[PDB]
Design a protein around this ligand. Structure first.
Ligand code: FE
Ligand code: FE
Ligand code: FE
Ligand code: MG
Lengths: 122, 121
C-alpha cells in the first residue's frame, strides 16, 4: 500500500510502511502516528488539481486559515513513483504545487493543520 | 530542515540527535551519511539539472543494480521541499525528479543496501 504515517513533535518524521503501533522517541516525547481526520472536512480535506505534470493541492474546497495561530504547515503528496513534501509559507495561501515526471502519477495528498492535525484527499 | 534517515523507511526533518524509532519490534537510529568505507565514485550521487527536471545518477560510475547489491532510493532536498523515489532493482542506478519553476535543487542523498547513505550536490 506504501502507507504513509506522520509523527510530529518543531519538525517531524515521515514513515513509509511503518508497522502498526510504531513510535518515535525524540526528547522525552514518545510520538505516535497521528490519525487522519464531517464539520472540519470543508476547511481541511486537500483538493487535488492536476494539469499535465503539475499537481496543485488546495486546503479548502474553500480556503483554510493561514495565520500565525492557525495555519496549514505542509502538504505531502504520495505518487506512484515516490513522495514529496513541501512546507507552506504561513503568510501565503493554503495551497502548493508539486511537479511530476512524465512517468509518474498522483495517488494521494495529505495536509497538516497545526491545530487540527493531518487530513487526506485525492 | 536537516534530513535524517531511519532505515528498517522513516525520514526525519529536524530530528533531535539521539532520536529513535520503534518500527514495530525493530529500533532504528539515524544512519551516518557518507561514513561507510566504500567507493565514493560509485556512491556519491551526481546531480544534473535540465530545465525543471533533476536527474540523479549513482554515482560518477554506475553502481550495481542487482538483487544482492542495489541503490534502494534517492532523496532530493530542494529549496521548497523534499522528494524521495525508490529505484526499481532491475533498472539503472538513476532517477529523475521534477521541480516547480520557483524551486531549485540543493542536495541529493542515496541509500545503498550494503554501503549506507551518501550525499552529494
Ligand atoms: Fe485547522
Ligand atoms: Fe540549479
Ligand atoms: Fe554499494
Ligand atoms: Mg525557476
Amino acid at each position: 500500500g506504501r502507507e504513509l504515517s506522520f509523527f510530529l513533535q518543531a519538525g517531524f518524521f515521515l514513515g513509509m510502511d511503518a508497522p502498526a503501533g510504531s513510535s518515535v522517541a525524540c526528547g522525552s516525547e514518545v510520538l505516535r502516528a497521528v490519525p487522519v481526520g464531517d464539520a472540519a472536512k470543508e476547511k481541511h480535506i486537500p483538493v487535488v488539481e492536476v494539469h499535465g505534470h503539475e499537481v496543485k493541492v488546495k486546503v479548502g474546497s474553500v480556503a483554510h486559515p493561514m495565520t500565525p495561530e492557525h495555519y496549514i504547515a505542509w502538504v505531502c503528496l504520495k505518487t506512484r513513483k515516490g513522495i514529496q513534501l513541501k512546507e507552506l509559507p504561513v503568510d501565503g495561501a493554503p495551497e502548493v504545487t508539486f511537479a511530476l515526471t512524465a512517468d509518474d502519477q498522483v495517488l494521494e495528498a495529505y495536509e497538516f493543520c497545526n491545530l487540527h492535525g493531518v487530513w487526506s484527499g485525492k
